[PDB]
Every structure is written in structure tokens, then in C-alpha cells.
Design a protein around this ligand. Structure first.
Ligand SMILES: CO[C@@H]1C(c2ccc(C#N)c(Cl)c2C)=NN2CC[C@H](O)[C@@H]12
Length: 240
């Protein structure tokens, strides 16, 4: 099980948000902590992505771009898994020090998005998603969004995506009905990431007004990479 040995080995550890849980809840503090957590998660996602089997087959310019486009979806997917395993989808487990209950979902003004992420969390239980399926699905999520004008070397990306889909087939084989369920679950991440992309974009544009902090590396991606997705230049690869 060489492929699965690697995914398990490179799987990031626990990442905290650094949120002050002794403050009474506020919109500004909650989303500043989400933004800070997004910064910290991005660092771990880059190190995770670069250690993936066959990742440096990609063109150097494509490596960071692919991570930055998939970044939000990857965070959402892993968070849903965290939520399922830690609290049985009762709350959104963004981090040990940032667990969203229904009040915090409302307070963040992302209630609709949180509800859909809670549904995603529950689907891990309903579908009985194994830890190994999760790891392969999450790796496949990285290679599930590309620019319409094409990557620097689209062929290497296409080959790499195909290989990860093959590994998912092998994990399933031990098939058709299962592959259908998992690809449908993967597809459901993209609409959620879209809504979050739109929401964090708007928040960045009015950040100065609402007193929400955006780290340097966050402001860049949400101002440079995310608008390409929102403007239709970069689109996700849907199975169905
Ligand atoms: C930078 O990403 C933020 C975010 C976010 C942050 C950390 C994590 C984690 N872990 C997750 Cl799942 C999400 C959806 N969700 N987005 C909505 C609000 C916020 O500005 C932005």
C-alpha cells in the first residue's frame, strides 16, 4: 500500500486558530480568527501538496497556482471530516480552539454556508466514508480546478489527475455505486467553496469598515487568485 502509506504519512497534524474563546462572540473577532486559521492552514496545505506522489511532475508555475485555486475546497473538505470524527457533525470543527455552534454560525454571518458544510460533515457518516477514502478524495480535490486558458503544462496535470482517480478505483475495489457516491460528494464541495470565495472576497473589500483582519498572504490570494474563479476564468472539474 505504497500510495496510501504516503497520504497517511504526509497528512497534516492539528492546526489551531489562536482565537480568544474568553471574549464574548463578535463578528470581527470570529472571522479574523478564521482568516488567521486560513493563513495557517494554507502553510500546511502547501507543505502537504508538495509532498504528494507525482506533484513535482507539474510545471513549477502550475504547482502554486493549483494549490491556491483548490485551497478553499481542501480546507472545507478536511474541516467537514474533522467535524464528523471529533464531534459527530454537531458543530463545525474549524480548529480545537475554534468550534462553531449554531450561535457562532449566525454570528459569523455565514449561516447558509455553515449549514451546507455541516451537511457535508454529516455525509461522511451517512456514506460511511473510510479514513483511506477521505485521504484519496482530499488528494483528488487538489487537482479538481483549472483555468479555461489552460495551465502552463496541462498534459502533466491531466496525467496526474488520472492517476489519482485510478488510486481511488483501487481503494474502492476490495464499485460502480461507490464511485458514484464519492464523486457526487466531491462535486458538492465546489458550490460550497464558491459561496465561501464570494463571501471572503466581499469581506476583504470592506475589511477596513467591519474591522476584520486579513493576513498578507490571505489578501494576495483572495485579491489575485480567487477573482479568477469568481469571474469564470478558473473553473472546477465536476464529475457530474
Ligand atoms: C480564509 O478563509 C476563510 C474561511 C475558512 C478558514 C479556515 C478554515 C479552516 N480550517 C475553513 Cl474550513 C474556512 C472555510 N472561510 N472563508 C469565509 C470567511 C473567511 O474570510 C474565509
Amino acid at each position: 500500500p505504497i500510495f496510501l502509506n504516503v497520504l497517511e504519512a504526509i497528512e497534516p497534524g492539528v492546526v489551531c486558530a489562536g482565537h480568544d474563546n474568553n471574549q464574548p462572540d463578535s463578528f470581527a473577532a470570529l472571522l479574523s480568527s478564521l482568516n488567521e486559521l486560513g493563513e495557517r492552514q494554507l502553510v500546511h496545505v502547501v507543505k502537504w501538496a508538495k509532498a504528494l506522489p507525482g506533484f513535482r511532475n507539474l510545471h513549477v508555475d502550475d504547482q502554486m497556482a493549483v494549490i491556491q485555486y483548490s485551497w478553499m475546497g481542501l480546507m472545507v473538505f478536511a474541516m467537514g471530516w474533522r467535524s464528523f470524527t471529533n464531534v459527530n457533525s454537531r458543530m463545525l470543527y474549524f480548529a480545537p480552539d475554534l468550534v462553531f455552534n449554531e450561535y457562532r454560525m449566525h454570528k459569523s454571518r455565514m449561516y447558509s454556508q455553515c449549514v451546507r458544510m455541516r451537511h457535508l460533515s454529516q455525509e461522511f457518516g451517512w456514506l460511511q466514508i473510510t479514513p483511506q477514502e477521505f485521504l484519496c478524495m482530499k488528494a483528488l480535490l487538489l487537482f479538481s480546478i483549472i483555468p479555461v486558458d489552460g495551465l502552463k503544462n496541462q498534459k502533466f496535470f491531466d496525467e496526474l489527475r488520472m492517476n489519482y482517480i485510478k488510486e481511488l478505483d483501487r481503494i474502492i475495489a476490495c464499485c460502480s455505486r461507490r464511485f458514484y457516491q464519492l464523486t457526487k460528494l466531491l462535486d458538492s464541495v465546489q458550490p460550497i467553496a464558491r459561496e465561501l470565495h464570494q463571501f471572503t472576497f466581499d469581506l476583504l473589500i470592506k475589511s477596513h469598515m467591519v474591522s476584520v483582519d486579513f493576513p498578507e498572504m490571505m489578501a494576495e490570494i483572495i485579491s489575485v487568485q480567487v477573482p479568477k474563479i469568481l469571474s469564470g476564468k478558473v473553473k472546477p472539474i465536476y464529475f457530474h
